[PDB]
Amino acid sequence: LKAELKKSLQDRREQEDTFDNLQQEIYDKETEYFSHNSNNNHSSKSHYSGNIIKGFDTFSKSHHSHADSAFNNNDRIFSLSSATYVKQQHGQS
């Protein structure tokens, strides 16, 4: 039945739209989450600057520097956990 066919296709399109939107939102949110570091050290004065996942004893006043804004792309441990993401990554590079 072509009616059932199109009824499936519309919901399919909506579902893939929602999936892509979720992917993009996760991406940008994790970028902001990993990049927020520098603002606390540059502006109480909780000198503890550094995340919890990538953070190490720089998440303690034993160290002091301003390069904390450095982070590569091999740290997106929340978006890497999908198959589409890694396949697209390896395809484009």
């Binding site: 919890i52 998440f59 890497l80 956990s81």
Partner: peptide
């Protein structure tokens, strides 16, 4: 119990999920 043992299990579970999906 929050600075060390949470990332271990979180990354472990995410790795398992990626393995299954792949």
């Amino acid at each position: 119990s929050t600075l060390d043992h949470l990332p271990c299990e979180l990354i472990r579970s995410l790795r398992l999920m990626q393995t299954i999906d792949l």
